Amino acid sequence: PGATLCLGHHAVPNGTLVKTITNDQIEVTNATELVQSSSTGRICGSPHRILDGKNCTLIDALLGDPHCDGFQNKEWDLFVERSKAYSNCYPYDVPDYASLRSLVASSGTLEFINEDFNWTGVAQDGGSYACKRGSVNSFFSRLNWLHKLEYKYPALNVTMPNNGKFDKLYIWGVHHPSTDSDQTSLYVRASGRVTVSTKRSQQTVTPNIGSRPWVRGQSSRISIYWTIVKPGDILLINSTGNLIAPRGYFKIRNGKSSIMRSDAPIGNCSSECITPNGSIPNDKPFQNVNRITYGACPRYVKQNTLKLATGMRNVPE
Amino acid sequence: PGATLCLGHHAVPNGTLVKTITNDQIEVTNATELVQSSSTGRICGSPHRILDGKNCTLIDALLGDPHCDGFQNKEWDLFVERSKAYSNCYPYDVPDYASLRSLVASSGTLEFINEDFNWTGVAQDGGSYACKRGSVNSFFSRLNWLHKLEYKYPALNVTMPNNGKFDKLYIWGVHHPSTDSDQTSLYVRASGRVTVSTKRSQQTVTPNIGSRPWVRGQSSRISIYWTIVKPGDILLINSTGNLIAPRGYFKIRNGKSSIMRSDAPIGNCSSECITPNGSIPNDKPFQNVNRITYGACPRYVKQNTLKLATGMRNVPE
Amino acid sequence: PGATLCLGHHAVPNGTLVKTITNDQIEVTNATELVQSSSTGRICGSPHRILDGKNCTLIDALLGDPHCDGFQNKEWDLFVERSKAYSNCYPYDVPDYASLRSLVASSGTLEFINEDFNWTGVAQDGGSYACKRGSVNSFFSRLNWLHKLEYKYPALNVTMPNNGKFDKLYIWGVHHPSTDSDQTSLYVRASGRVTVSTKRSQQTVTPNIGSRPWVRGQSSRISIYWTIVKPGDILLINSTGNLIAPRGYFKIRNGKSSIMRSDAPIGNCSSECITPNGSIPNDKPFQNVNRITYGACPRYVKQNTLKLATGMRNVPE
Amino acid sequence: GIFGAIAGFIENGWEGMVDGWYGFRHQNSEGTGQAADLKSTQAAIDQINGKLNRLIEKTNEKFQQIEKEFSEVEGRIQDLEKYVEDTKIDLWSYNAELLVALENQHTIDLTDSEMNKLFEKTRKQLRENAEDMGNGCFKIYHKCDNACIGSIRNGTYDHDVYRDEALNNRFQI
Amino acid sequence: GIFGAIAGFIENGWEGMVDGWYGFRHQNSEGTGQAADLKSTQAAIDQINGKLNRLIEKTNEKFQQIEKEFSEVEGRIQDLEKYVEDTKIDLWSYNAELLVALENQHTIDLTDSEMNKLFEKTRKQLRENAEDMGNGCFKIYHKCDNACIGSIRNGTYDHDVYRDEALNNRFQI
Amino acid sequence: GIFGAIAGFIENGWEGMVDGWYGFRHQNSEGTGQAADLKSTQAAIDQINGKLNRLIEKTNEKFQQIEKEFSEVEGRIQDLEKYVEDTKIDLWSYNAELLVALENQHTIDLTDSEMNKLFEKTRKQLRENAEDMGNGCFKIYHKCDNACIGSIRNGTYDHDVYRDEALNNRFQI
Ligand SMILES: *[C@@H]1O[C@H](CO)[C@@H](O[C@@H]2O[C@H](CO)[C@@H](O[C@@H]3O[C@H](CO[C@H]4O[C@H](CO)[C@@H](O)[C@H](O)[C@@H]4O)[C@@H](O)[C@H](O[C@H]4O[C@H](CO)[C@@H](O)[C@H](O)[C@@H]4O)[C@@H]3O)[C@H](O)[C@H]2NC(C)=O)[C@H](O)[C@H]1NC(C)=O
Ligand SMILES: *[C@@H]1O[C@H](CO)[C@@H](O[C@@H]2O[C@H](CO)[C@@H](O[C@@H]3O[C@H](CO[C@H]4O[C@H](CO)[C@@H](O)[C@H](O)[C@@H]4O)[C@@H](O)[C@H](O[C@H]4O[C@H](CO)[C@@H](O)[C@H](O)[C@@H]4O)[C@@H]3O)[C@H](O)[C@H]2NC(C)=O)[C@H](O)[C@H]1NC(C)=O
Ligand SMILES: *[C@@H]1O[C@H](CO)[C@@H](O[C@@H]2O[C@H](CO)[C@@H](O[C@@H]3O[C@H](CO[C@H]4O[C@H](CO)[C@@H](O)[C@H](O)[C@@H]4O)[C@@H](O)[C@H](O[C@H]4O[C@H](CO)[C@@H](O)[C@H](O)[C@@H]4O)[C@@H]3O)[C@H](O)[C@H]2NC(C)=O)[C@H](O)[C@H]1NC(C)=O
Numbered sequence A, B, C: 001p002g003a004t005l006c007l008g009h010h011a012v013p014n015g016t017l018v019k020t021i022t023n024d025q026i027e028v029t030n031a032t033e034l035v036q037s038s039s040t041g042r043i044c045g046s047p048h049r050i051l052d053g054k055n056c057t058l059i060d061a062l063l064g065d066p067h068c069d070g071f072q073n074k075e076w077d078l079f080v081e082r083s084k085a086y087s088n089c090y091p092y093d094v095p096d097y098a099s100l101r102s103l104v105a106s107s108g109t110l111e112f113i114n115e116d117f118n119w120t121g122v123a124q125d126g127g128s129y130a131c132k133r134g135s136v137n138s139f140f141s142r143l144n145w146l147h148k149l150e151y152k153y154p155a156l157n158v159t160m161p162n163n164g165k166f167d168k169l170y171i172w173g174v175h176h177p178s179t180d181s182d183q184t185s186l187y188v189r190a191s192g193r194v195t196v197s198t199k200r201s202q203q204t205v206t207p208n209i210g211s212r213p214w215v216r217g218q219s220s221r222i223s224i225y226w227t228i229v230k231p232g233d234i235l236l237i238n239s240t241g242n243l244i245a246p247r248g249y250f251k252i253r254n255g256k257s258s259i260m261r262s263d264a265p266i267g268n269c270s271s272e273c274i275t276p277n278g279s280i281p282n283d284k285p286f287q288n289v290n291r292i293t294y295g296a297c298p299r300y301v302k303q304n305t306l307k308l309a310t311g312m313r314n315v316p317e
Numbered sequence D, E, F: 001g002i003f004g005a006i007a008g009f010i011e012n013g014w015e016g017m018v019d020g021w022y023g024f025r026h027q028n029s030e031g032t033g034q035a036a037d038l039k040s041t042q043a044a045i046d047q048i049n050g051k052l053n054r055l056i057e058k059t060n061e062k063f064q065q066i067e068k069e070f071s072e073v074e075g076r077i078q079d080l081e082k083y084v085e086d087t088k089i090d091l092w093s094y095n096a097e098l099l100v101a102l103e104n105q106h107t108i109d110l111t112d113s114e115m116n117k118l119f120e121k122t123r124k125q126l127r128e129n130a131e132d133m134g135n136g137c138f139k140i141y142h143k144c145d146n147a148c149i150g151s152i153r154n155g156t157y158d159h160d161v162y163r164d165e166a167l168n169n170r171f172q173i
């Protein structure tokens, strides 16, 4: 007689269905998930420098809203802005808010360098009960509210050379008084005009007297503008009234920094990839947690599962 | 002797050429076209709510140009704007026209809610022979042209709270008179100023007296502006003259609605995919009709034919 | 006994490593590089019409800065702007500079058509020592600086119909004088206003008197604006002072033209693909020289090498 | 091509085979005939129908996008609008070209594989009773009438019945 | 599928084979047994581990991008912001779907190929001493005890030792 | 790899084979020699030249795009300009990486297939006159001089001329 020798392959009782070019569902012995679909629900504080905005937006921290004073000169890899944040200073708006937030976020620092502007002829350090710092009526820490001195406000013509080797970010504003009385009680003339120039550019603003909706005790507003002065260029400031002056500049950087909207708590852990839902592992090539990410992240896709076969076809006995 | 058994495969006399990784053209027995390259040439009225703009742009229907009155409060999945459309009211321009058209188109409704503004002290319902409604000189149906009353125009300060739970879209304007005489004959002061505010934002406009090119009997213009007021916020209107006031708000929605430029006729048929050329089948994964589509559409590609082999290599006898 | 017949394949001693789905590095007998990673370092003057900007930006050539006079009416497929370029005329800024540069670059021509504007009542051909043409104080060649005539500047109302079949590009400006004295010594009234209209649109500008930083002898500026007038439409110009008038229009085209920033020299050679680093071959499907290209180019990728196997697995003896 | 059966060791196809994709032709003591093989034909058709369904899945319901035609020259924002869409169409055009190139390559290879599998299946049954002439045919070394051909086509061929007859015929002088 | 070994001429898999992916079952004069084949098992595992590593390479460190959620209605610029990202996610979703479809197709085909290579390797050793019964087994035409089975599994089988015995058994009457 | 011929049952390649990709080495009563096989060599080269041409087709004439370098910090619009291009380059980088990975996988598999097809073609001709030793060689069981080797290489080998001699030699004791 003799013998019989059979050749064969293994099988498992608990196979998994995968997709191919030909077949939406064919059973294989083993597979691995390629789509990340969970988060811890917390943002890990390592390895990125996470700065929790707390009650402060980035813009409120930049201007120096008093409850944001603790953010002065701070740095971040990722600024986390919280949805409970509140402004609590003079009512303001920022034309092209989104761009200012973006370029400050990208610089990754609120490092502020005080400069000695020559404001002889006007008073300084104006304040408001809408922007309390301790008990004293106050104002944005990084801004200098100029008003009249002995009942005159002379045409200011103030310059500042950039003799350094880096770009300077200047934040300044324009006051829109509620009434003509307040316009003249502050600035004498019935309408002012703020012009900020460099060798390459010019931004001129006119106040619009009139009541806006009531906000934190005030029907009046400030508008926030910004000007970047390159090395060798110069800032020149011209205003016949209503100028909300800079106190100096923010050092503008560029780096790997950004900003994210999230309510996830910051935790003592390490993860390269951050989403608004929390940090996620990046062992898989794709993820379904959020299209918003920061760091070394799996790429966002619509699928909630993609299984890669890691074994042969399963053919049960 | 015995027998011979031959194994073989079929062939056809009329094969088709397809592309592979290796070969731009190899003959197979059968193939199917994967690129849609035809349209019926008509837009099917099902299953999407198609609103034919006819002689009306969306913007003319929004403002309420008289020949567009029939579009009041109407809704759409797809607004079809026709190239023969004409404005026939007061000459106007809309700064960032494209954005207003986009956000109204995306809301998918012109549903308008009248509100009782307090305009005591000015006259209402100004009109023009350039905007005839029937025989009477008239104006945009959704806008209220305020002018002087007993030879005075008092500073208006008018508010409107949003006590609802939805966003309100307000459309308003600024009149630019042709001459100083008309400026003062309407508004008394030689130059007015329109300020529209919310708690978060402010848009202030100044008229520019002077003649524009002659259009429908007028050298003068109106400029269209818009303001969205969120729930719990408030619209406050301040103007010393030249205000083209809202009559109320449009309810802003978001949904699956859009707008399309097309001259294709609307027909009694069903197709998920609409292009400016007409509706197209979506049985194929790709299409070459138009990069502009709406609905469940094959993806637009540059190729005019892509053939998927559906049979083996063809090897003729 | 008999014979032995062995079947075999070739091998080489100097194989090359390639990537597969399975293996990052498997040795094959031969391969070819698919990523272009070198440039000659010069931009070939064929087959595209290369216009070397030399010391001139495109915008300086458009306005007609005197050292750019040689660029009048010239054409290009690719305008090459050099980093050493300098402005040397009246200090100016262009709001949305980037867009004007883009649309002029895309038209591919500076062809300028002089028109006979009716400027009776004002003087013409104002100039400045900051914009020397030869020895004479002068100005942008394509612009007409209007000032007062016998100590009056009457309200200008000047029109120009487009009776042609093509679009007209009009470049014009607004003068911002340094001082009130210069404002009135030029324009009589203390503040002017420039309005440029078509049937569809209106751009009105107000000068902002005041000193900007010192540039080429001047603390004053000009702002550049542009207006495109379609066939059958009309340009109407209204200004009570400070108008920097057009001398006519640029014919606007559309074609395959663009602009590129590069310091590479232009050479007597032929290459379909141009990058800022110089022309590159386009025999490979991908390239790593620069994401900025013009012409028939390999597609830009991050990889610096991608090797396509052109032979079998290499199995050394 | 990848298996050398179709467009290879099997000289060419059969235009008269219009009841299947694969099949049998025979010559024996009762004449000649032709019969389709249903399983290998269906196995190929099922795979091809599979790939057609996967391409006909995506919905790509898109509603409000960006404008893609412009009547005014605008500069920067329109350049970006135009560039984004151009970028999109070129990437999909690559995906479409490559998908078809991959699918078509796989279809020819997979239809070649069904051809080879039927040859090997038939070979294995015939055991020592037949030899491969190398042109897609077997020489069967015994009398094998139409019922006998049917048993090979049906997979019920009993090689042991014929082995003595066949071996005696194979190993002659 | 592409080779017809797995899910084909080999009826089905062995659930009791839990020390390898491929292997041997035998029946002989001393009984029956089962042994895994380590090289073909490792060859498949190495290829699969290879493809897993290539998918787990990319860093895709991205830091400052665009905003992707918006609390205000804005029109043109936001339509473009939304459209660009939607465009991006749909293209990656295609890449991910296709990658998995290609990888999975290749994994089944490549695991099928290891099965066939082991069959052919084993066939070639057995030379004229065995016949393929067509179901993934060889009939061995000589006495072949456990040490003998071990020599086939180990690749040390000397066919010349058994050829006379086997040929005499194959070519009977 | 997918066929186990190259980098598999054929121990290794021949560095002295510099007139072709595939070929023959023999040992017989007149000595030894080596000859390239032109058709299988050309068949592989034609397929590879085919894939090279498909990659060298696209024009991708692009003229006026967006700016991609910026000397000023601008915020929102530039973030979108930067993001769109970054999105574009990453998708093409994936396409390029995958294309090469797919092409290279297919090239090794397809060159392996040409190797196997030549082995099977040669096997089928030899019929019962040779046996496969499993290392890519045939033992030919008859006197087979250089003209005889030439007839196998040329495809004109007449197995019937040698079958009696070969069968008598194969089935000895
Ligand atoms: C143009 O028209 C607008 C709107 O009509 C006017 O704006 C109003 O101005 C008045 C006068 O200052 C404001 O009155 C103040 O309102 C504050 C906010 O009220 C909140 O609480 C009430 C509760 O009933 C809510 O209904 C309301 O919506 C708010 O949530 C009050 O807190 C103020 O009172 C406090 O301060 C004053 C001193 O400042 C004290 O005397 C009080 O005792 C109390 O401590 C005050 O009553 C009103 O809110 C404004 N409304 C809006 C919508 O802006 C403009 O003034 C008008 N312009 C001109 C030039 O006339
Ligand atoms: C600044 O400069 C501009 C341009 O020079 C002036 O604008 C012109 O103003 C006049 C005065 O109103 C306008 O005259 C009117 O033109 C209408 C349009 O004419 C059409 O038909 C003619 C046919 O020859 C075409 O050539 C032309 O292009 C138009 O297509 C006429 O229809 C008007 O006549 C009708 O109305 C009047 C009453 O309104 C009746 O008396 C007539 O009988 C008839 O029914 C009228 O003649 C002229 O069109 C304007 N042109 C432009 C380009 O705007 C500004 O007025 C000027 N500003 C100042 C302050 O002076
Ligand atoms: C508001 O405030 C600003 C800044 O404080 C004033 O702007 C200054 O105005 C003065 C007066 O015209 C300018 O003075 C001129 O400066 C030119 C540039 O100087 C260069 O070289 C010096 C070398 O020391 C550098 O330090 C400097 O940074 C520059 O690089 C000089 O070249 C001028 O002199 C030449 O021209 C004059 C005639 O025009 C001749 O008399 C000289 O001999 C020489 O040929 C001249 O001195 C000054 O540059 C301005 N600075 C800035 C930053 O703008 C505004 O004037 C002021 N506004 C009002 C209304 O007061």
Ligand SMILES: *[C@@H]1O[C@H](CO)[C@@H](O[C@@H]2O[C@H](CO)[C@@H](O)[C@H](O)[C@H]2NC(C)=O)[C@H](O)[C@H]1NC(C)=O
Pocket: A180, A209, A210, A211, B155, B156, B157, B193, B238, B239, B240
């Ligand atoms: C709305 O704002 C305007 C400013 O544009 C205010 O205008 C003043 O109105 C008062 C009368 O109430 C006049 O005496 C002033 O001369 C106006 N000033 C200017 C600069 O024009 C107006 O007061 C505000 N509305 C209300 C109701 O107060």
Ligand SMILES: *[C@@H]1O[C@H](CO)[C@@H](O[C@@H]2O[C@H](CO)[C@@H](O)[C@H](O)[C@H]2NC(C)=O)[C@H](O)[C@H]1NC(C)=O
Pocket: A037, A038, A039, A277, A288, A289, A290, E069
């Ligand atoms: C991560 O967060 C996002 C958004 O915060 C979640 O997406 C939401 O999913 C719900 C349904 O579960 C929808 O109603 C919302 O509209 C989605 N939000 C958006 C912005 O589309 C997502 O599910 C979260 N993922 C995890 C794992 O928690």
Ligand SMILES: *[C@@H]1O[C@H](CO)[C@@H](O[C@@H]2O[C@H](CO)[C@@H](O)[C@H](O)[C@H]2NC(C)=O)[C@H](O)[C@H]1NC(C)=O
Pocket: A030, A031, A032, A310, E052
């Ligand atoms: C199914 O396959 C997975 C992945 O191929 C295997 O688990 C891996 O095991 C390797 C070692 O072989 C380890 O490096 C990892 O811990 C595992 N990786 C992953 C992604 O899971 C294993 O062969 C099978 N797993 C199970 C649970 O059956």
Ligand SMILES: *[C@@H]1O[C@H](CO)[C@@H](O[C@@H]2O[C@H](CO)[C@@H](O)[C@H](O)[C@H]2NC(C)=O)[C@H](O)[C@H]1NC(C)=O
Pocket: B180, B209, B210, B211, C155, C156, C157, C193, C238, C239, C240
């Ligand atoms: C162009 O528009 C201006 C407005 O900026 C008009 O200016 C008026 O001109 C007349 C003389 O024609 C003066 O009496 C008025 O005082 C000016 N008004 C203002 C507000 O400055 C000018 O009239 C228009 N052009 C023409 C030709 O009429």
Ligand SMILES: *[C@@H]1O[C@H](CO)[C@@H](O[C@@H]2O[C@H](CO)[C@@H](O)[C@H](O)[C@H]2NC(C)=O)[C@H](O)[C@H]1NC(C)=O
Pocket: B037, B038, B039, B277, B288, B289, B290, D069
């Ligand atoms: C669908 O419409 C588009 C545009 O309306 C057509 O594309 C045009 O094709 C012609 C040549 O046949 C070109 O001259 C135009 O420039 C194209 N238009 C654009 C905007 O590029 C397209 O051919 C139409 N398709 C069908 C099937 O009718």
Ligand SMILES: *[C@@H]1O[C@H](CO)[C@@H](O[C@@H]2O[C@H](CO)[C@@H](O)[C@H](O)[C@H]2NC(C)=O)[C@H](O)[C@H]1NC(C)=O
Pocket: B030, B031, B032, B310, D052
């Ligand atoms: C060529 O192939 C097509 C598609 O593979 C076949 O026609 C299909 O037939 C199926 C049933 O087998 C039906 O569901 C459809 O009506 C057809 N679909 C398509 C896309 O055509 C058929 O095998 C061949 N057609 C022709 C005309 O030869």
Ligand SMILES: *[C@@H]1O[C@H](CO)[C@@H](O[C@@H]2O[C@H](CO)[C@@H](O)[C@H](O)[C@H]2NC(C)=O)[C@H](O)[C@H]1NC(C)=O
Pocket: A155, A156, A157, A193, A238, A239, A240, C180, C209, C210, C211
């Ligand atoms: C800054 O620019 C303003 C213009 O907004 C200049 O304002 C003039 O100032 C002088 C006094 O220096 C007054 O006599 C004029 O009446 C003002 N003109 C206007 C139109 O308001 C101001 O002069 C400039 N600054 C300096 C220091 O000169």
Ligand SMILES: *[C@@H]1O[C@H](CO)[C@@H](O[C@@H]2O[C@H](CO)[C@@H](O)[C@H](O)[C@H]2NC(C)=O)[C@H](O)[C@H]1NC(C)=O
Pocket: C037, C038, C039, C277, C288, C289, C290, F069
């Ligand atoms: C082509 O030019 C680009 C930019 O001019 C070169 O990219 C630079 O590479 C250096 C390192 O070698 C970096 O420090 C720069 O930051 C890069 N520039 C940018 C804009 O990223 C590129 O290397 C050049 N290629 C060749 C072949 O010369």
Ligand SMILES: *[C@@H]1O[C@H](CO)[C@@H](O[C@@H]2O[C@H](CO)[C@@H](O)[C@H](O)[C@H]2NC(C)=O)[C@H](O)[C@H]1NC(C)=O
Pocket: C030, C031, C032, C310, F052
């Ligand atoms: C390696 O392969 C390359 C490309 O496959 C070959 O060189 C090509 O030779 C063809 C003719 O066979 C010519 O058209 C070209 O000049 C070459 N093209 C390229 C892209 O190099 C050749 O087989 C091998 N080259 C070397 C140097 O070994």
Ligand SMILES: *[C@@H]1O[C@H](CO)[C@@H](O)[C@H](O)[C@H]1NC(C)=O
Pocket: A014, A015, A016, A029, A030, A031
């Ligand atoms: C099968 O069950 C085992 C035992 O629990 C488990 O480890 C394995 O992951 C399962 N495999 C699949 C594909 O479900």
Ligand SMILES: *[C@@H]1O[C@H](CO)[C@@H](O)[C@H](O)[C@H]1NC(C)=O
Pocket: A054, A055
């Ligand atoms: C934020 O404000 C609220 C109320 O004052 C409080 O929960 C919390 O103390 C504040 N956060 C910080 C960081 O002070």
Ligand SMILES: *[C@@H]1O[C@H](CO)[C@@H](O)[C@H](O)[C@H]1NC(C)=O
Pocket: B014, B015, B016, B029, B030, B031
């Ligand atoms: C071949 O001709 C038949 C008969 O008209 C037709 O049905 C079939 O579609 C044709 N096939 C090809 C590939 O042209």
Ligand SMILES: *[C@@H]1O[C@H](CO)[C@@H](O)[C@H](O)[C@H]1NC(C)=O
Pocket: B054, B055
């Ligand atoms: C559009 O206007 C023209 C001219 O009045 C006419 O063809 C048609 O009746 C109008 N359309 C509608 C819907 O009234």
Ligand SMILES: *[C@@H]1O[C@H](CO)[C@@H](O)[C@H](O)[C@H]1NC(C)=O
Pocket: C014, C015, C016, C029, C030, C031
């Ligand atoms: C191997 O060396 C030859 C001889 O110089 C050369 O032509 C060939 O390109 C080399 N091949 C590889 C893959 O390095």
Ligand SMILES: *[C@@H]1O[C@H](CO)[C@@H](O)[C@H](O)[C@H]1NC(C)=O
Pocket: C054, C055
């Ligand atoms: C550019 O200016 C510099 C200095 O005048 C000089 O190198 C060169 O001659 C100028 N270029 C041209 C084209 O005149």
Ligand SMILES: *[C@@H]1O[C@H](CO)[C@@H](O)[C@H](O)[C@H]1NC(C)=O
Pocket: D146, D147, D148, D150, D151, D154, D156
């Ligand atoms: C083979 O099967 C077919 C259909 O199942 C049947 O018609 C035929 O008679 C069978 N032939 C034999 C020889 O079993």
